[PDB]
Amino acid sequence: TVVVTTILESPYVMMKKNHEMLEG
Amino acid sequence: LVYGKADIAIAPLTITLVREEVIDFSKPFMSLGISIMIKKPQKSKPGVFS
Amino acid sequence: LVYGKADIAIAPLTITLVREEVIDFSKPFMSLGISIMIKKPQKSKPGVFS
């Protein structure tokens, strides 16, 4: 496995609606 | 990345000299630049003497 | 370059996977692409008795 680092930046990296339900 | 906390930063990170001196970048996967943003040219109010 | 005849190539040379396999490329010094080319619109001059 690897440690991919990013930032919250739409539309590059966006959280889905069901981010509280799913955690991965 | 320099301190080992991450392997690869797949993010919109700009290839620049300062950063380039400490990490290594892949070839750009996206080329961009500075640009002008304006409001869409709405219809003008008819002038007196139009 | 690969066979040692030259020590650096500073012509306009595309960055491609095939070429990148055998040599080293700097970061791009000029970004470009395919583009469309047409004749200038050539504004019409109206006839006198138009």
Ligand SMILES: O=c1[nH]c2cc(C(F)(F)F)c(N3CCOCC3)cc2n(CP(=O)(O)O)c1=O
């Ligand atoms: O690395 C490459 N760089 C190239 C650079 C140019 C130009 F920008 F024009 F200088 C051109 N053309 C020269 C004349 O035709 C139009 C553009 C070809 C190039 N080609 C061959 P291609 O891939 O067959 O186009 C390459 O391989």
